Structure 1
Amino acid sequence: MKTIFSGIQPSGVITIGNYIGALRQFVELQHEYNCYFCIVDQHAITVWQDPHELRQNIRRLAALYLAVGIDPTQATLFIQSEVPAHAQAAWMLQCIVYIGELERMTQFKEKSAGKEAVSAGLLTYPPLMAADILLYNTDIVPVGEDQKQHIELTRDLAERFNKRYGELFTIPEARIPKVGARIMSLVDPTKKMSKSDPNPKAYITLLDDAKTIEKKIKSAVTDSEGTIRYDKEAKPGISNLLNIYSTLSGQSIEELERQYEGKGYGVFKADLAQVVIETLRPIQERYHHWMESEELDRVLDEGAEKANRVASEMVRKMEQAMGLGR
């Protein structure tokens, strides 16, 4: 089948927005395509991290990905650092990428007006990300609007390498998410929902307990009209809430409007709070079952193992072309 590579920054918290926009759809994709889900812990180290928190967030993320419904026998789930080829191929590519290319990256602006105290990791992480991708001959890389820049560079490195040393890598394509909706902040309906929002009331986490989901939805910003009708502009807040309600319950927007006809936001919010709790419940159940189970490790184990099989043969061929070793 076609291959798909997806790197996951270990951070132990993914929003209902991530779930709805991309994650959820993967459970389907994993039968049509050959998926790889790498918990890129080496990339997470480019910025300060607490060792214990990071070690923890790596298990959390794997627990949660399985909990959501990723099948470890169908797809491949693994931790980046337990597959050495990543770092090995990262070095080889660093050697074919020019400094300029990495400097002119619309993300290295992190150098902040004379910071200087920036890890070289920040500057060099793109060639590692190219490795993550290229090592498995991936075809599609499900990234957002923002990442596109990195995809292009890996595409460039792939070809540069191919022409200099021979046809080895597959040029990857940056495919966008399905969504067709987008989940906005509950506190500012114009802004997009994210884990990195300074206000916790802005998002709902797949591990938020009922009491907290109840609390956050009540607070979600609506408007003064008092009617449950879809209106992108004019009624941003309601329209968002309706969007969340609809994708999770399977009921149309037209349907939900008709249902909440002469009802106000008070009950609407109380209803939504429920549909969310009813939807996260099994996930939070399964998740804890995975955090307790030693079967988790056995999964990561065969994950790496399956990944290593391919990565290695790729590096072998890379070292072969470059002229390294024997």
Structure 2
Amino acid sequence: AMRVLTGLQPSGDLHIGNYFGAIKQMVDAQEKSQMFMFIANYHAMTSSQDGEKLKQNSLKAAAAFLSLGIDPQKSVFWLQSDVKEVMELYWILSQFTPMGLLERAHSYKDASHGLFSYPVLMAADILLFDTRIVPVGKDQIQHVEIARDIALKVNNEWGEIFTLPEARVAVVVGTDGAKMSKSYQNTIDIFSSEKTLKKQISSIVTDSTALEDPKDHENCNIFKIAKLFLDESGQKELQIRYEKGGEGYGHFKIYLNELVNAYFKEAREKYNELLEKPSHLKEILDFGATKARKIAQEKMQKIYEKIGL
């Protein structure tokens, strides 16, 4: 079984696209492999230097992933900056990185040195742990390939010291029909207040269809989100309500509201428990950092032989 490593964005608020799209699958994969996952809070600094906001974002990211089912016993789960080894490997990988490689990168292309450089720091996270597989999206594919390129450059020079990582890649619709995404501001958040959740579900864009008539559920965003929360029978019963007529889109929102609350009630409660007693969160994160620091310290020793430390 291959080593799968995921960096996790601390920034922002987790939404149900994230959940049914990435996380749920990842949480169910914790049995067939030792997963490694980290809140990349180092990368978070390229786009912000408000410390207090960054700090909170990390605690909150931490708690959110745990409550959605990351089990720190099965997997290796930690805060990036807790394993400082990556920082020194970053420096070493830089010496093997041609500028051109970075100039042609895409999050920069598409301007601080942090922003230009972060692909090397990413290669360091990947390479430090002999990652076989990096689960990403299209947007992050060439970052993985850049780490693989750095790896080949180092191997040629030092012998095979690094595993060559390989990138691995059904849409949740957002509020407006598009892919749900923070950047489109069309999301339904998981850890928000009931009041905020009702507002988000209210913004869902609908047909003009009149309350009295049959509504098309095949093209209704409300029905598409709801599909995520129901089996075939619950989906049939709501389809029958669309067709029958006599209920408005507003009635369906109330229903989606209750579906979304019920579904995440536990994760929400666990989240709040984690943030009310943060000494437990720290402990979970410290425990994950220990397992990762042990793998990292051991790769580093081998690097140190090659680089003379």
Fold equivalence (TM over 0.5): yes
**Secondary structure of the residue that 1:319 maps to in structure 2?**
helix
Q: Report the alpha carbon displacement of residue 283 of structure 1 after superposing the two structures with TM.
A: 1.3
- Given the alignment, which residue of 112, 126, 129 partners 2:122? 129
8 Å contact 2:173–2:225 — kept in the other structure? no
Provide structure 1 residue ranges, at least 5 long, that are not aligned to the other structure: 111-117
1:49-198 to structure 2, matched below 5 A, reads 49-109=49-109, 118-176=111-169, 180=170, 182-186=171-175, 188-189=176-177, 191-197=178-184
Q: Letter of the 1:162 partner, please give it.
A: N
The yes-or-no answer on 1:317 pairing with 2:302 is yes
8 Å contact 1:12–1:58 — kept in the other structure? no
1:225-236 to structure 2, matched below 5 A, reads 225=209, 227-231=214-218, 235=219
Q: 2-side partners of 1:141 and 1:229: how far apart? A: 39
Q: Report the alpha carbon displacement of residue 255 of structure 1 after superposing the two structures with TM.
A: 5.6
Q: 2-side partners of 1:27 and 1:251: how far apart? A: 23
**Secondary structure of the residue that 1:313 maps to in structure 2?**
helix
Q: 2-side partners of 1:297 and 1:223: how far apart? A: 47
Q: 2-side partners of 1:122 and 1:218: how far apart? A: 37
Q: What residue in structure 2 maps to residue 38 of structure 1?
A: 38
Q: 2-side partners of 1:175 and 1:256: how far apart? A: 35
- Given the alignment, which residue of 228, 237, 250 partners 1:266? 250
Distance verdict in 2 for CA 1:174–1:281, change over 3 Å: same
Q: 2-side partners of 1:19 and 1:136: how far apart? A: 26
Q: Letter of the 1:270 partner, please give it.
A: I
Q: Report the alpha carbon displacement of residue 67 of structure 1 after superposing the two structures with TM.
A: 0.7
Q: 2-side partners of 1:259 and 1:171: how far apart? A: 52
Q: Letter of the 1:257 partner, please give it.
A: Q
**CA offsets per residue over residues 20-63 of structure 1, 9 Å max, x none?**
10112211011112211111111111122310011111111111
8 Å contact 1:35–1:76 — kept in the other structure? yes
Provide structure 2 residue ranges, at least 5 long, that are not aligned to the other structure: none
Q: Percent identity?
A: 39
8 Å contact 1:5–1:140 — kept in the other structure? yes
Q: Report the alpha carbon displacement of residue 280 of structure 1 after superposing the two structures with TM.
A: 2.1
**CA offsets per residue over residues 237-270 of structure 1, 9 Å max, x none?**
x1x3223211223346556423543144232221
TM-score (norm. length: structure 1): 0.87
Aligned Cα root-mean-square deviation (Å): 1.8
Q: 1-side partners of 2:2 and 2:82: how far apart? A: 24
8 Å contact 1:41–1:81 — kept in the other structure? yes
Q: What residue in structure 2 maps to residue 241 of structure 1?
A: 222
8 Å contact 1:40–1:80 — kept in the other structure? yes
Q: Letter of the 1:35 partner, please give it.
A: M
Aligned residues: 302
**Secondary structure of the residue that 1:77 maps to in structure 2?**
strand
Q: 2-side partners of 1:260 and 1:277: how far apart? A: 22
Q: 1-side partners of 2:149 and 2:53: how far apart? A: 35
